[PDB]
Amino acid sequence: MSREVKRIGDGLFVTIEPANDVRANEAKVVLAADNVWGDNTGYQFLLDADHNTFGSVIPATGPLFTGTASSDLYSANFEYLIPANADPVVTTQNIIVTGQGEVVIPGGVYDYCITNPEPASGKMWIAGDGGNQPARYDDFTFEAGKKYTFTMRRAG
């Protein structure tokens, strides 16, 4: 259900700071990664402002999809994305491999998941839950005036 090597997968480590560079009704989300799996595989952050995708478009367990996806899997369901041109393709380069990408979003309620495309296995995996925050989430509140940094690392 999760990508793992030697029973060691990956995970999400969240940091929140005051955001002082956005509007009063805005939050900032950052996705940071540093070649976590050593193979130039990366990550995408998917945000649904309608928070109605958990359990249907975002599966409660297992990868987001395998193999081929409908070309509108993101454009129909997720309003905000990191990177901004993130697309539902396992082979895409529209991923955060090293460094970070960001998105400024309304304060509000969201469903989200973080993906880790792996061409070698044909899976658009959702990242593991071995960090301090689940990598998929139903009705998370991103509060205005705050900056959420989601840092990806290897985890149990």
Author numbering: 360 to 440, 441A, 442 to 515
Sentences from the paper on this structure:
Porphyromonas gingivalis is a major pathogenic oral bacterium that is responsible for periodontal disease. Although its detailed function has not been elucidated, PrtH contains 989 amino-acid residues and multiple domains, including a cleaved adhesion domain, small Ig-like fold domains and a DUF2436 domain.
We recombinantly expressed the DUF2436 domain (residues Ser361–Cys579) of PrtH (UniProtKB ID P46071) from P. gingivalis in Escherichia coli. Purified recombinant PgDUF2436 was successfully crystallized by the sitting-drop vapor-diffusion method at 293 K. The crystal belonged to space group P3221 and contained a monomer of PgDUF2436 in the asymmetric unit. In this study, the DUF2436 domain of PrtH from P. gingivalis (PgDUF2436) was determined at 2.21 Å resolution, revealing a noncanonical β-jelly-roll sandwich topology with two antiparallel β-sheets and one short α-helix. Met516–Cys579 were not modeled in this structure because of very weak electron density in this region. The size-exclusion chromatography result indicated that PgDUF2436 exists as a monomer in solution. Analysis of the electrostatic surface charge of the PgDUF2436 structure reveals the presence and location of negatively charged patches. The negatively charged patch on β3, β5, β8 and β9 is formed by Asp407, Asp409, Asp431, Asp446, Glu438, Asp497 and Asp498. Although the structure of PgDUF2436 was determined by the molecular-replacement method using an AlphaFold model structure as a template, there were significant differences in the positions of β1 between the AlphaFold model and the experimentally determined PgDUF2436 structure. However, DaliLite search results using structure-based alignment revealed that the PgDUF2436 structure has structural similarity Z-scores of 5.9–5.4 with the C-terminal domain of AlgF, the D4 domain of cytolysin, IglE and the extracellular domain structure of PepT2. Collectively, these results demonstrate that PgDUF2436 exhibits a novel structure with a modified β-jelly-roll sandwich fold topology.
